[PDB]
């Protein structure tokens, strides 16, 4: 079952954490957005229907929905998860734990503008994320945090080409149906210590992300 995150107790530390995110967003010319956003110029909210997912989509349970809403409310009142955005010479911006994060803890929703994959065929963004994979490829959707987004777009991925790379993975990106809509969330897959860098698998489903050069 999903567990809510435990925000750092010192308010100064939460301030620092949010500051590191604000500066990274600024560097990438982005605004902060902790929800999926829709528009008629791209993909209307009505296109996001989990029943369109080829082969079906797992449904988030009432209990885990309650936990998701607790976490969302915490973020809005200023209790963010204990995470620091830090520049790394090899990886660029990366995300690391700034407090303990237990196995099964909700980390973040992957947010940004939602759009049709067919509309992003020629897009250079390095942070596109699958939202809905439909039988008809012209109905499939992607999340694009190129203009708006949150901390999730800064999390690193593993090298899918090395025997040792999977050993680094300490969280997982999953897609769940919530009130009938697709949603993408990140969850810890083991206990994570302070200072530890977060990594998930960019190629969970489709293998559309090149990682042979990753550290």
């Amino acid at each position: 079952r999903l567990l809510p995150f435990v925000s750092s107790e010192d308010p100064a530390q939460r301030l620092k954490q949010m500051g590191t995110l604000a500066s990274a967003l600024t560097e990438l010319q982005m605004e902060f957005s902790d929800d999926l956003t829709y528009s008629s110029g791209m993909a209307p909210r009505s296109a996001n229907q989990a029943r369109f997912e080829e082969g079906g989509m797992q449904v988030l349970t009432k209990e885990d929905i309650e936990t998701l809403e607790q976490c969302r409310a915490m973020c809005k009142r200023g209790d963010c998860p204990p995470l620091l955005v830090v520049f790394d010479s090899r990886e660029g911006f990366t995300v690391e734990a700034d407090g303990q994060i237990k196995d099964m803890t909700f980390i973040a929703e992957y947010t940004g503008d939602v759009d049709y994959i067919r509309n992003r065929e020629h897009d250079d963004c390095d942070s596109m994320m699958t939202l809905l994979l439909a039988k008809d490829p012209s109905s499939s959707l992607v999340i694009c945090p190129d203009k708006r987004g949150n901390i999730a777009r800064f999390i690193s991925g593993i090298n899918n080409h090395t025997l040792d790379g999977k050993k680094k993975q300490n969280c997982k990106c999953v897609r769940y149906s919530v009130n009938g809509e697709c949603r993408v969330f990140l969850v810890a897959t083991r206990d994570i210590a302070k200072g530890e860098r977060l990594y998930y698998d960019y190629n969970g489903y489709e293998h559309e992300y090149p990682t042979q050069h990753f550290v």
Partner: peptide, 12 residues
């Protein structure tokens, strides 16, 4: 395009 992706079944 380069696209990250996640499963829609199988839990965590």
């Amino acid at each position: 395009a380069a696209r990250k992706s996640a499963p829609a079944t199988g839990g965590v």
